[PDB]
Amino acid sequence: PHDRWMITYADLITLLLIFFVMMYAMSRLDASKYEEVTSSLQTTFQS
Amino acid sequence: GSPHDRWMITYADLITLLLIFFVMMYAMSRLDASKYEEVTSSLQTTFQS
Amino acid sequence: MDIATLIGLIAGAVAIIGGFLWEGGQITGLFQGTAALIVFGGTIAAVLISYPMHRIRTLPAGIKLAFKPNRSEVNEWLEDIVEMSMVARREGVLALEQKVLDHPNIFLREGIQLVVDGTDQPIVRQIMELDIDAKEQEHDNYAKLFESAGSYAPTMGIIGTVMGLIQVLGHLTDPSQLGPSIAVAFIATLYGVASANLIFLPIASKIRAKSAEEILVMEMILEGVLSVQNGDNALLVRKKLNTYIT
Amino acid sequence: MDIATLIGLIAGAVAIIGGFLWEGGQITGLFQGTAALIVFGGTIAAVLISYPMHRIRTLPAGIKLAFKPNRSEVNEWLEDIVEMSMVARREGVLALEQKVLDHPNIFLREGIQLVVDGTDQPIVRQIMELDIDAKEQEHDNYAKLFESAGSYAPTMGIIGTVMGLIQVLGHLTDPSQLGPSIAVAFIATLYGVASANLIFLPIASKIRAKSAEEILVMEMILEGVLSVQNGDNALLVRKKLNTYIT
Amino acid sequence: QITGLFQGTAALIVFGGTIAAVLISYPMHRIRTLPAGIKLAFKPNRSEVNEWLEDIVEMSMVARREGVLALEQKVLDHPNIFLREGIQLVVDGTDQPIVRQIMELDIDAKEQEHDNYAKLFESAGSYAPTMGIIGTVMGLIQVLGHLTDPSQLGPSIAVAFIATLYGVASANLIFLPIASKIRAKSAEEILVMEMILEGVLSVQNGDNALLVRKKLNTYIT
Amino acid sequence: ITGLFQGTAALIVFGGTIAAVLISYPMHRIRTLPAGIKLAFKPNRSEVNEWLEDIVEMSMVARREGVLALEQKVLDHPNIFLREGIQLVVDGTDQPIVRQIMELDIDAKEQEHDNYAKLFESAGSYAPTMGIIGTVMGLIQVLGHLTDPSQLGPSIAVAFIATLYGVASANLIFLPIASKIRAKSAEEILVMEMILEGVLSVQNGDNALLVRKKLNTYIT
Amino acid sequence: ITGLFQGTAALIVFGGTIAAVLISYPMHRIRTLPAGIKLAFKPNRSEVNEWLEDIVEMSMVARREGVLALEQKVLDHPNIFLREGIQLVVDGTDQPIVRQIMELDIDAKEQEHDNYAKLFESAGSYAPTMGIIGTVMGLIQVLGHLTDPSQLGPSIAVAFIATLYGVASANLIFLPIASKIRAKSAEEILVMEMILEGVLSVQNGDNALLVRKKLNTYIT
């Protein structure tokens, strides 16, 4: 019973996710922003 | 509940991280209302206001 | 049905649905066929696997125990047992038989016949406690079905939200089909949590709460039958048995 | 009220509100109609379904036990229980009656009365332990209402959250100004978690803590009335009973 | 509907990982018992207890008239071995607390065998959901690392979440549900054995027939 | 790390945790937390290996010299529970009664240490949920600034810090301390159970080799 | 696979787990942890069948040669628990006291194995929560500088790999080891109970058929 928190936290976060996904859905991502993170990510992933 | 639910700590972790990703990606992008409009009417019919 | 359940369900509907209707929702907005099939179909499956069929066919008796209207009969049987002890102190054991030969409580009737037939006191308790612990096991075997159903349904919810995300995330670039898809990620959570916490787990608690009251009356009748065999004096019989009453 | 609860509730309100104000906010934005009605209405509905009505009518006595200030003068009754043993030793058991005509503790009175009437030791243990078991069961039955209120309220929080989002997204018809509307929907999770962890589960804990503190004093009185029957010496009586005192 | 919901690399992570966790978690001689475990889980009852009682009941009547010497008519070897052996401990050379002790050790052994079957399925059903998360996180690490266009990010993440769906569904529809049925049939088999211990001891006490059916029927639903 | 520290997220989690233990227990219990920690971090200098030799010597003195010679030795012994035990047997009290009086003291010591641990077990049960409360009060405020993704990122980042304090304090401080109290309780109850078989074997007059055999089963 | 090693994620998850376990247990427990693993992974040399024949032999001896003959049969026997048990019966000690002396060794061995498994089970409880701490310290860093400053990708990694270490270590190393320790204690304790039932049956002088029938209940 010391684990009560995780079973509610889970739901809270989950509800946020599903909303935010939808939010992003009706938005457009400038390529410049994407590249800096995607190119920065791959090489830093140790690729 | 018994230890069978011990996987919950982890599941939380997965979503939390996924949340980081989508929220992270959302901020960088402003929204094009046209997409916003279609969804608002795409959902309006579904929940039937 | 039963007064606390009737007040509970009325309060439940006015809270959950009546709150949503104040802020202008629609009842048909909370129905989604695919979410109901995943959560309730998934729950029913996990239950039919996890128990033999002769257990599943007992669920009517489980509900009938949970919502049995309450009876004060314990307060009557206390006087009967004391009267029988009063007879035992003063009269031939034939009176304990013929005083009981029409009695409505079967467990008491059988128990008294065991002492008038002259069976030994530490043998009588070994048949009476056998008859009790069979009744205790029957009610536990009812409650475990609802405790299982209320354990599976939440997780089938998470097997609904993820099977909802796998639809939405698949059509990110199509805002025309995102709308009907995103609904599953909400509603499958809602059926998973609401069924567990407003139907299954409350019923399980109430079966167990009514079982404890059934068993206490049997435990009182046992101390009754044994005190009649001892020939204990009426005031002390009243004093012992009254500890099982409130 | 119990002094620890008074300090506790002041600390609780100052921590929650003092934190919420310090990071910027006003209290009138933290109160919401539909969220309170769903979370508390749903909790009440789940508890009413979960228990017979005769249990729910005892809930006031749960609070009266929980916030009882700790008078308990076990250190005073110890001197009575020791002294009564000396009366049996010097003047025989029949002199005990005069010492206990009027004693405030009814459990002590009944125990001594069974001993002066000359009941057998295994019988006086049996008849007294039934009273302790009845008191222990009564207090457990108080606490389960608060434990079950505490396990339903968080999940009603989630249901109140999801219904909030369903209405906002449903009739969204809004100018990309959803931030306020979405935000309010999370107030139901705040009421669900706060009520469980600052009211229901803490009250349950205190009921169980005060129950154990009371049952110990009854178990002391049991060793008190058994010891006067066996006729132990004063030093051994004072040695035994002290093990039940902190 | 079934639309592209089968992915191999996701079944291999979940089931391969579950098998790995279970093989580490138990000695080999446990694993070789799983065939018996699943047969106990899904095996017809064809309960005859309503018959074993009749036999146990009848035997009492023989002892009351005919001496224990003629109680050896059970040497026909009633199909239930426990009853055959039990009554062969009531044949002379024995005493009541010793007959109880030898019989009750067989029951305590059989209760421990069935629990040891079910513990494998309980543990398998706990490891599988957690491996699902490992499969998902391994998938996400591969995607995010090598991201091309923002366009395909959506579809890729979806094919990655299937590990989780395989894991959680496997646990709550296969492993944990079986574990329940193994244990639920064990508590029905042990109950019959405890009844016979009631039969064997009572006959040795030479109790009256009518009481015999009252003691035994207590165990019968 | 000056950006990982906070005022308000610490006040909601720690103040909320304190409010939840103060409501949850009587006042007289809360004043015992110092003694709980003093048990948990009691430096180990334990001498069970010394008391075993004392008990064995006492037995063979009782079996040779008669029970009354026991009185002289027990007076100076530092272990109060052992002293009282022998004093009962010097008083010639009956064996089922010596067991009863001694076992009440062991049960009382086991119950006292359980009552110490439960404060930390419950503190570590509340603190994660106060993290969730502190988080959600952050999000309710921030989601107001959703319009500008300029500050949404930085704002959310600080809102999750209440989760971090709630989980870190629970799993690195409260639940570990609770575990250590229980671990060091068992290793003191064991010593008392050994003293009990010591005192009873002195009363039965069993020979030194058998006493040394029985008592060593409580030692590692 | 070269991309799955991440320094800061290992330090948060394993350093956190080590810290939580060191707070949770006295040092004299942790110094015995090697013996936990050596119990888990030793081969099954189990020879219960070999001993069973020895006890049956001693019963047949005890009925015929007298109790004093048993000493010569156990004089150099490899199983110490059997040796001590038989010797207490040749020395003529009473049944309720030879029961009481033997059962204390079994209880000590059962407690010694549980003390090993709990350290492993605890490590498997903490490491997943260090996962959440590693993730959230990561999210606080990522959302802190969301200006595509080019550092987002490196910090997203730590947030993923801390999950992977926390979950994989718990469910493939620590918690799996724990199950084996508990399952292999239940081999040894069962064999000890068989040897006890052997020694008591030899003292009561039960015949070979009764001895073999009783002892078989502990074998499969």
- CA-based nearest residue in chain A for residue F128: A5
Q: Cα(F190)–Cα(C64) distance, rounded to whole angstroms?
A: 51
Q: Which two tokens stand for residue D170?
A: 């449903």
Answer for the pair E78, E157: CB distance below 8 angstroms, yes or no: no
Chains B and G share 3 or more Cβ pairs within 8 Å: yes
Residue E169 to residues C155, E10, F4: CA-CA distances in angstroms? Answer: 9, 13, 38
CB-based contact A45 E141, cutoff 8 Å: yes
Identify the residue among G4, G146, G148, G167 best suited for mutation to test binding to A, counting A beta carbons within 10 A and taking the highest. G148
Of B31, B44, B48, the CB nearest to D172: B44
Question: Nearest CA of chain A to the CA of C75: how many Å?
Answer: 39
G-chain residues near E167 (CB < 8 A)? none
Question: Nearest CA of chain A to the CA of C185: how many Å?
Answer: 7
Of E106, E113, E140, the CB nearest to G160: E140
Q: Which two tokens stand for residue C162?
A: 């993820």
SS3 of residue A27 by DSSP: strand
Of B4, B14, B25, the CB nearest to E137: B14
Phi, psi torsion values for G197, nearest 5 degrees: -60, -30
Instruction: Report the candidate in G138, G136, G137 with the shortest Cα–Cα distance to residue G156.
Output: G138
B-chain residues near C175 (CB < 8 A)? 35, 38-39, 42
Question: Nearest CA of chain G to the CA of A28: how many Å?
Answer: 16
Answer for the pair G45, G188: CB distance below 8 angstroms, yes or no: no
Residue G4 to residues E145, E148, F129, G8: CA-CA distances in angstroms? Answer: 11, 21, 32, 12
Residue B31's DSSP bridge partners are: A27
Q: Cα(F99)–Cα(D93) distance, rounded to whole angstroms?
A: 27
Of E154, E168, E218, the CB nearest to C159: E168
Residues with Cβ < 8 Å from C139, sequence gap 6 or more? C65, C207, C208, C210, C211, C214, C215
Question: Nearest CA of chain G to the CA of B41: how many Å?
Answer: 31
Q: Cα(D206)–Cα(F30) distance, rounded to whole angstroms?
A: 12
CB-based contact C206 D127, cutoff 8 Å: no
Residues with Cβ < 8 Å from C165, sequence gap 6 or more? A17, A18, A21, C185, E158, E161
Helix (H) or strand (E) holding C193: helix C178-195
Answer for the pair C39, C188: CB distance below 8 angstroms, yes or no: yes
Measured between its terminal Cα atoms, the distance across chain E in Å is 43
Residues with Cβ < 8 Å from C55, sequence gap 6 or more? C141, C145, E184
Please name the residue ranges forming H helices in D51-105. 53-56, 59-66, 74-91, 96-99
Chains that touch A (3 or more CB pairs under 8 A): B, C, D, E, F, G
Instruction: Report the candidate in G156, C105, A19, G6 with the shortest Cα–Cα distance to residue D186.
Output: A19
Chains that touch G (3 or more CB pairs under 8 A): A, B, E, F
Answer for the pair E196, E25: CB distance below 8 angstroms, yes or no: no
F-chain residues near A8 (CB < 8 A)? 129, 132
B-chain residues near G163 (CB < 8 A)? 10, 13-14, 17
Q: Which two tokens stand for residue E127?
A: 């490891």
Q: Which two tokens stand for residue F16?
A: 């909320």
If you ran DSSP here, which 8-state letter would residue C72 be given? -
SS3 of residue B31 by DSSP: strand
B-chain residues near F152 (CB < 8 A)? 23, 26-27
Answer for the pair D87, D94: CB distance below 8 angstroms, yes or no: no
Q: E93: alpha, beta or left, given left = phi > 0 and alpha = psi -120 to 50?
A: left
| Nearest-10 Cα torsion for D128, D132, D135, D136 | -160
Answer for the pair D180, F141: CB distance below 8 angstroms, yes or no: no
Question: Nearest CA of chain C to the CA of B36: how many Å?
Answer: 8
C-chain residues near D138 (CB < 8 A)? 246
Q: Which two tokens stand for residue D125?
A: 């243990």
Q: Which residues of F15-50 are buried (b: 16+ CB within 10 A; e: fewer)?
A: bbbbbbbbbbbbbebbebeeebeebbeeeeeeebee
DSSP states along chain G = -GGG--HHHHHHHHHHHHHHHHHHS-HHHHTTHHHHHHHHTS-----HHHHHHHHHHHHHHHTTT-GGGHHHHHTT-S-HHHHHHHHHHHTT--HHHHHHHHHHHHHHHHHHHHHHHHHHHHHHHHHHHHHHHHHHHHHHHHHHT-S--S-HHHHHHHHHHHHHHHHHHIIIIIHHHHHHHHHHHHHHHHHHHHHHHHHHHHHHT--HHHHHHHHGGG--
CB-based contact B13 G163, cutoff 8 Å: yes
Q: Cα(E93)–Cα(E106) distance, rounded to whole angstroms?
A: 20
Answer for the pair F22, D8: CB distance below 8 angstroms, yes or no: yes
- CA-based nearest residue in chain A for residue G160: A45
Gyration radius of chain B over CA positions = 17
Instruction: Report the candidate in G7, G188, G206 with the shortest Cα–Cα distance to residue G105.
Output: G188
B-chain residues near F149 (CB < 8 A)? 26-30
SS3 of residue F162 by DSSP: helix
Question: Nearest CA of chain E to the CA of A16: how many Å?
Answer: 17
Phi, psi torsion values for B31, nearest 5 degrees: -105, 140
CB-based contact B28 A37, cutoff 8 Å: yes
- What one-letter code names the amino acid at F178? A
Of B35, B44, B46, the CB nearest to C175: B35
CB-based contact C171 E185, cutoff 8 Å: no
Q: Cα(F103)–Cα(F110) distance, rounded to whole angstroms?
A: 11
A-chain residues near E146 (CB < 8 A)? 42, 45, 47
Chains that touch F (3 or more CB pairs under 8 A): A, B, D, G
Handedness of CA C68, C73, C77, C80 (dihedral sign): negative
Give CA F177 to chain center in angstroms: 9
Q: How many CB atoms lie within 10 A of CB D31?
A: 10
Cβ-Cβ contacts under 8 Å between B and F: the total is: 12
Q: Cα(E16)–Cα(E24) distance, rounded to whole angstroms?
A: 12
CB-based contact C119 E211, cutoff 8 Å: yes
B-chain residues near F153 (CB < 8 A)? 23-24, 27
Q: How many CB atoms lie within 10 A of CB E195?
A: 20
Q: Cα(D220)–Cα(F107) distance, rounded to whole angstroms?
A: 14
Residues with Cβ < 8 Å from F62, sequence gap 6 or more? F69, F70, F202, F205
Residue G76 to residues G61, G101, G102, G118: CA-CA distances in angstroms? Answer: 17, 21, 19, 36
Cβ-based interface (< 8 Å): residues of F facing A: 121, 124-125, 128-129, 131-132, 135-136, 139, 163, 166, 170, 175
